[PDB]
């Protein structure tokens, strides 16, 4: 007696028995807007997606409440869901982020498979027997696609006679795959290639939402009629509708251990496949090696590196996000954190892996471990508009500017030992960068006469680097072992470059530049935000040419491209803090020790006390 | 004691001649951007221009009596001076290129200089001698002089940059000014000769004034008010520091406004304006477009003139050999005019506000304003029947020809149709017909009918795409129309015979027509021009005015022949009719009614 399992917006539901007594059982319930479901039968698992909660979840078939969040981030319209009962993975399409991804059956080791040339991918079917997953994306040009469940050999099989190509489901007995259509109102049928496209229920009668099957019988939903239907597997004949008066049936599967035929796993319980991900594959070994998103795989294969090497950190108004720079996929932002009101400036310390950032409604500086409970506060007192912040990763101090109080101030990274280095009456400090070797700190500031100044790392030797033809200078990156210093200006709308001493000057490109501007450099590339702050460009600093790595991301405020862990440069401050008991501030001549407000430097020129 | 007054954007302030002394703002209200500044010590009053408000205002030193004296036809009133003797207000506008004058309270405004003006900036008066001086900031800056009536204009000093703070040392007969291009303060006698440089080592001099043996100036760079020996340029001290954006400065003392002339006494017996002149003491003046009567003392308003409206203004211009400047009528009610007409009987101006969707009324004075149609209603065009005292108008919403009395009460609809869409309309009550454009979908046409809606007929249905304006000449029985799409002006007999194209070249967008004597005036929205052709063809197409933005309508006003007017059978008692009074071919009158009424046995009542 085939049990049918189906989503229902408000709950997941199991029905059929032997098609009698109308025992539709509310498997899970109290959901909000459920779309897709699936199961791994052996483990007694039921998964679904929720479009209002933008999460994918799972429960235990037994009498229990047990529900676990499985994905709860990075999702917009997960409308297709397929469990891999063999390789033990979870696949799912998202029709609005236009991605296709995979994870372990606990949401972990989450890898993005495909993300290019996808228009509203929906229905999804796995063939763990082979290494083939099938799905349908539809849009300006609809199509059904095949590829390996490993990310390989993306083949377009059916690309004609389709419009809104509908539910996918495969006959393992016959090595044929069926599909429907939410517009042209047919059911078809082919071989697992694009081959032998036969009609099973041609003619405009079926208006199926989701197809399944069990022993010669095609079942499906027609939301309109609020019904479930069924007919011969071979012709349209037999077309009765199973008992169904159901409040918006969506996704549906035959809930039967027979619809998941078990077999040999391409990796054993041995190996566990690789180090992170063993995905099934058509390729000879029949399994393949994978790392999570943004993580590259060693030349040996089978072993994933540790995390990303470079990394592009975003600050939006109300969240932080990181894009990796190790992989082509890019637009995999991923975020974190709580109580972020209005983020402005961002920076990072590779040594301890703390992200530092400013928020100018909260009026505070904070730090975190990325996707880590890093979160502590750092500064919260006497702050106005922290429009720029810089980590000194050698002396282990934190610099930040302030627009409301027109100051530059330094503290140790933990916000201890605060000391005002610069406080100008007219001009007001905005964006700031550091050179802990060479002992310079450069910064843009606005004002009646907008200039770009520089000084030693204690504010001592003020030199005005740039003075003329600058309206509102914004970003300010630093190319180190090339001695150039890149910046922008909102008023004039052009990104210029310069010699480290203020001489090699020249427009690099013209650009319409936002007032709050994200702008950073790392490895030949420059990254900035567009005029509408919904997109980020990658530009060659040596080659001048532009590119857009991610759009449709509003409220971008500030960026920082950075190595993770990797650190460069040094000076004697790194030696037990220069011998200074509090603040050690490096200069070209040589370090100078300083003190928090109220303290006094003794003739040691090394020590502070309270008088 | 003599004290110093200066304008400073949002406020006007007073200080003493003493260094670092107290600096107090005159308690004024609603000042946005004060620029030009003068005073009237005898009346204890200050006058200032606001280039943001586009106005000239005055008030007492105690801030009381804040009133606007000029609030129309201003663009950039950068220059302004008080004639304390004749009690007149002079001002210059760099945007409108005009030097104007009026009474100190603002009435009887008149244009003194309008030709060959290229940005008049600063203005200094010498009513005792009958001369006025001003600086000019064109391609070739200069300092000109003229009689205080605008006569005898001549350049006094030609070799100068943008001069400012033009001030006269009356006692010692000299002129001082700053130069914004050479950063110096110069001086010369009242003839522009004996030209000396008082100070040259100045970074950014702007304002200027003098009193006794010192000159005071402002400096935008040093943010200051400094003074120095007026002849030497030395013994320099700073009076005030840290002053941002000091526009104009002046010395408030009685000794600055002395002297006398024939105008100070009974206003020279002048009916309106008393204007001092060097040779002859003074001359009597009149408001714009007014004529000075044979008595050399009184004025008469213009009898015939031409009205052209824009989006935000209605202008009047006369046809003189002198080419007198057009002026903006001071109607406060104006916002978005779409069409204009004029009742010569009561001498009042009618227009349609396209935004507030009403037909308003007011005399050229701007006073006696009154709404005659309000609301759905969406008036498109109007045509006044001056005999029956009726307005025939068209509604873009209900697609009808509606007729309303001048006082506000309705007569009724005279034309309504399922597929009919009346737009442009002109009534010819002398013959008993009305003419209008009927913009039916995909087949535009020009029609005629009796003033009651009967005897409809199509005059023209081909050679049309956008019949956009109508005009007729009752005396010559001619009809004129303009087509926006076909870019041409056509003519015909009232009957519709003898259709002839008048002009079909170098036209882009005609939107208004009007007959003035033997000429056909029309306005081109895109070309931004007023042009005219001779209906007789004897003389050639002539440009009247260029660079007029957002032209909406133009309308000729001829002097009403009261006697010839009363000859009309509907002139009095409306021909004994209750509603519409039609004129038979034999000069006899019937009575008709709107669409909703019927003529009774009285053959007079509806």
């Amino acid at each position: 007696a085939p049990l049918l399992l189906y989503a229902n917006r408000r709950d997941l539901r199991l029905v059929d028995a032997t098609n009698g007594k109308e025992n539709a059982t509310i498997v899970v319930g109290g959901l909000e807007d459920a779309a897709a479901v699936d199961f791994v039968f052996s483990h007694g698992l039921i998964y679904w997606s929720d479009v209002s909660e933008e999460a994918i979840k799972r429960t235990e078939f037994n009498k229990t409440e047990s529900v676990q969040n499985v994905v709860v981030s990075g999702l917009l319209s997960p409308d297709g869901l397929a469990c891999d009962w063999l390789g033990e993975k979870l696949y799912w399409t998202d029709s609005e982020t236009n991605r296709i991804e995979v994870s372990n059956l606990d949401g972990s080791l989450r890898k993005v498979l495909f993300w290019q040339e996808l228009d509203q991918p929906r229905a999804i079917a796995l063939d763990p027997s082979s290494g083939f997953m099938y799905w349908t994306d539809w849009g300006e040009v609809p199509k059904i696609e095949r590829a390996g469940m490993d990310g390989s050999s993306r083949f377009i099989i059916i690309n004609s006679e389709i419009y809104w190509p509908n539910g996918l489901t495969l006959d393992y007995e016959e090595q044929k795959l069926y599909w429907a259509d939410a517009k042209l109102n047919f059911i078809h049928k082919s071989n697992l290639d694009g081959t032998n496209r036969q009609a099973v229920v041609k003619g405009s009668l079926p208006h199926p939402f989701a197809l399944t099957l069990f022993e010669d019988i095609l079942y499906w939903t027609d939301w309109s009629t609020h019904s479930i239907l069924a007919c011969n597997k071979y012709t349209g004949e037999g077309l009765r509708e199973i008992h169904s008066d159901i409040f918006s049936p969506m996704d549906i599967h035959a809930f039967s251990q027979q619809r998941q035929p078990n077999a040999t796993n391409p990796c054993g319980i041995d190996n566990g496949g690789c180090s992170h991900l063993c995905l099934m594959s058509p390729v000879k070994p029949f399994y393949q090696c994978a790392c999570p998103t943004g993580v590259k795989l060693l030349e040996n294969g089978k072993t994933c590196k540790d995390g990303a090497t470079e990394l592009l950190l975003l600050a939006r108004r109300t969240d932080l996000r990181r894009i990796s720079l190790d992989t082509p996929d890019f637009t995999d932002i991923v975020l974190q954190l709580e109580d972020i009101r209005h983020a402005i400036a961002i920076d990072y310390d590779p040594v301890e892996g703390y992200i530092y950032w400013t928020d100018d409604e909260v009026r505070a500086i904070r730090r975190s471990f990325i996707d880590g409970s890093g979160s502590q506060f750092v500064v919260t007192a006497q702050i106005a508009h922290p429009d720029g912040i810089a980590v000194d990763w050698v002396a282990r101090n934190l610099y930040w500017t302030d627009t409301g109080t027109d100051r530059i101030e330094v503290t140790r990274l933990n916000g201890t030992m605060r000391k005002i280095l610069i406080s100008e009456d007219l001009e007001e400090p905005r964006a700031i960068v550091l050179d802990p070797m060479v002992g310079y700190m450069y910064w843009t500031d606005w004002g009646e006469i907008p200039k770009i100044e520089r000084a030693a790392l204690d504010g001592s030797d003020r030199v005005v680097l740039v003075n003329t033809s600058l309206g509102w200078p914004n970003g300010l990156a630093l190319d180190y072992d090339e001695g150039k210093i890149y910046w922008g200006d909102a008023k004039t709308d052009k990104i210029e470059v310069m010699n480290t001493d203020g001489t090699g000057r020249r427009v690099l490109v013209e650009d319409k530049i936002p007032h709050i501007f994200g702008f950073t450099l790392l490895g030949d590339y420059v990254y900035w935000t567009d005029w509408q702050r919904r997109s980020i460009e990658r530009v060659h600093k040596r080659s001048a040419e532009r590119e857009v790595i991610i759009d449709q991301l509003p409220d971008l405020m500030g960026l920082k491209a950075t190595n993770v862990h990797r650190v460069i440069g040094s000076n004697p401050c790194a030696e037990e803090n220069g011998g200074c008991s509090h603040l050690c501030l490096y200069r070209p001549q040589g370090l100078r020790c300083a003190c928090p407000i109220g303290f006094e430097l003794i003739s040691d020129m090394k020590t502070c006390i309270v008088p | 004691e003599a004290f110093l007054l200066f304008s400073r954007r949002a406020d006007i302030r007073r200080i003493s001649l003493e260094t670092n002394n107290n600096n107090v703002a005159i308690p004024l209200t609603g000042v946005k951007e004060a620029s030009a500044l003068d005073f009237d010590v005898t009346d204890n009053r200050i006058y200032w221009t606001d280039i943001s408000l586009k106005t000239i205002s005055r008030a007492f030193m105690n801030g009381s009596a804040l009133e606007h004296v000029v609030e129309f036809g201003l663009d950039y009133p950068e220059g302004m001076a008080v004639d304390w003797l004749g009690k007149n207000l002079y001002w210059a506008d760099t945007g409108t290129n005009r030097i104007e004058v009026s009474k100190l309270d603002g009435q009887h405004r008149q244009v003194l200089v309008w030709k060959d003006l290229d940005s008049p900036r600063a203005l200094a008066l010498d009513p005792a001698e009958g001369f006025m001086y001003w600086t000019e900031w064109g391609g070739k800056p200069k300092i000109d002089r003229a009689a205080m009536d605008g006569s005898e204009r001549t350049t006094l000093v030609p070799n100068v940059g943008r001069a400012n703070g033009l001030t006269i040392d009356y006692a010692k007969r000299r002129l001082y000014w700053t130069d914004l291009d050479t950063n110096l303060i110069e001086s010369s006698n009242m003839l522009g000769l004996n030209r000396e440089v008082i100070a040259d080592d100045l970074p950014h001099p702007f304002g200027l004034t003098q009193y006794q043996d010192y000159i005071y100036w402002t400096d935008w760079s040093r943010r200051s008010i400094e003074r120095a020996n007026k002849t030497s340029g030395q013994n320099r001290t700073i009076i005030q520091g840290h002053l941002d954006y000091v526009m104009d400065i002046l010395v408030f003392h009685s000794s600055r406004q002395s002297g006398w002339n024939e105008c100070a006494s009974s206003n020279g017996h002048c009916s309106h304006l008393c204007l001092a002149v060097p040779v002859g003491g003074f001359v009597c003046g009149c408001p714009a477009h007014y004529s000075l009567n044979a008595d050399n003392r009184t004025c008469s308003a213009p009898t015939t003139f031409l009205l052209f409206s824009q989006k935000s203004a209605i202008n009047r211009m006369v046809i003189d050999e002198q080419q007198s400047p057009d002026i903006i009528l001071p109607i406060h009610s104006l916002r978005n005019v779409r069409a204009i007409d004029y009742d010569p009987l009561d001498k009042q101006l009618y227009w349609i506000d396209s935004r507030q969707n009403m037909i308003r009324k007011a005399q050229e004075d701007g006073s006696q304003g009154f709404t005659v149609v309000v609301s759905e209603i969406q008036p498109y065009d109007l045509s006044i029947d001056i005999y029956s005292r009726y307005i025939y108008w068209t509604c873009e919403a209900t697609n009808v020809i509606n007729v309303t009395r001048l006082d506000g009460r309705s007569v009724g609809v005279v034309l309504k149709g399922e597929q009919d869409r009346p737009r442009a309309i002109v009534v010819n009550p002398e013959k008993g017909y009305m003419y209008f454009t009927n913009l039916q979908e995909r087949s535009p046409k020009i029609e005629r009918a009796a003033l009651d809606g009967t005897e409809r007929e199509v005059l023209f249905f081909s050679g049309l795409s956008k019949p956009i304006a109508l005009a007729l000449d009752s005396r010559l029985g001619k009809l004129f129309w303009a087509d926006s799409d076909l870019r041409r002006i056509e003519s015909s007999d009232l009957s519709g015979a003898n259709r002839i194209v008048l002009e079909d070249s170098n036209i882009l967008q005609p939107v208004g027509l009007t007959v003035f004597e033997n000429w056909l005036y029309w306005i081109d929205k895109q070309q931004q021009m007023i042009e005219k052709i001779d209906m007789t063809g004897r003389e050639g197409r002539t440009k009247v005015q260029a660079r007029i933005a957002q032209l909406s309508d133009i309308h000729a006003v001829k002097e009403l022949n009261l006697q010839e007017y009363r000859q009309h059978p509907c002139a009095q008692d409306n021909g004994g009719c209750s509603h519409i009074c039609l004129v038979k071919g034999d000069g006899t009158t019937r009575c008709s009614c709107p669409m909703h009424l019927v003529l009774l046995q009285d053959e007079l009542s509806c």
């Binding site: 009646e448 003329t468 | 391609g139 070739k140 070799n159």
Partner: protein
Amino acid sequence: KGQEGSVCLRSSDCASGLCCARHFWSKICKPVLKEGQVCTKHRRKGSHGLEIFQRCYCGEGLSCRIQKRLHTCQRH
């Protein structure tokens, strides 16, 4: 497009023979200078920032040079 005196924001908002120059505390369309016409020459860099009565540049094939003290638009 913008005519002389018309409020503008960029020279592109103005007509062919005009540029967007500031007058007081907004910008309006002003005409380009022609041969013989007086042009602006700033002494101090800062005087440029303070100018509220801005002239347009010299027209095509004209250079702002000194007379042979004012500066006028002259041909190369």
